[PDB]
Amino acid sequence: GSSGSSGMATKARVMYDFAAEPGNNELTVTEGEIITVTNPNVGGGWLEGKNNKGEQGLVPTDYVEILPNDGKDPFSC
């Protein structure tokens, strides 16, 4: 029926409101705002996420902490 245990659709929640300079390879996000993770492993401790607009930019993993996915559910409790 389904495919994948953890899932490919990774999500991350912003802990602190971060701003990206105009005309830069960075993305602008806000605290509480969630986005789609595409490249969580860029190189150095950064990740690439896309916004509703469809734009992609670099964001400091220190500002946003990726959230886990639905892990293998436990057997009949």
Overview of the molecule:
With 77 residues, the protein is mainly β. The chain has a single domain, classed as Roll (SH3 type barrels). 0% of the residues lie in helices and 32% in strands. The chain contains no helices and five strands. Strands 4-3-2-1-5 form a five-stranded antiparallel beta sheet, with no helix packed on it. The radius of gyration is 14 Å and the shape is elongated. The relative contact order is 0.29. It is classed as endocytosis. The entry lists the keywords SH3-like barrel, Protein transport, Structural Genomics, nppsfa, National Project on Protein Structural and Functional Analyses, RIKEN Structural Genomics/Proteomics Initiative, rsgi, endocytosis. The assembly is monomeric. Solution structure of the SH3 domain from mouse sorting nexin-9. The protein is Sorting nexin-9. The organism is Mus musculus.
Shape: elongated
What is the rounded distance between the termini? Answer: 23 Å
Q: Summarize the biggest pleated sheet.
A: 5 strands, antiparallel
H and E string: EEEEE
Radius of gyration: 14 Å
Could you please say which CATH topology applies here?
A: SH3 type barrels
CATH architect. name: Roll
Read across the widest sheet, the strand sequence of neighbours is 4-3-2-1-5
CATH class: Mainly Beta
Please give the share of residues in helix.
under 10%
Beta content: 25-35%
DSSP, total strands: 5
Number of helices: 0
Number of domains: 1
CATH-assigned homologous superfamily: SH3 Domains
Question: What would you call the structural class?
Answer: mainly beta
Subcellular location: Cytoplasmic vesicle membrane; Cell membrane; Cytoplasmic vesicle, Clathrin-coated vesicle; Golgi apparatus, trans-Golgi network
Family: Belongs to the sorting nexin family.
Organism: Mus musculus (Mouse)
Protein name: Sorting nexin-9
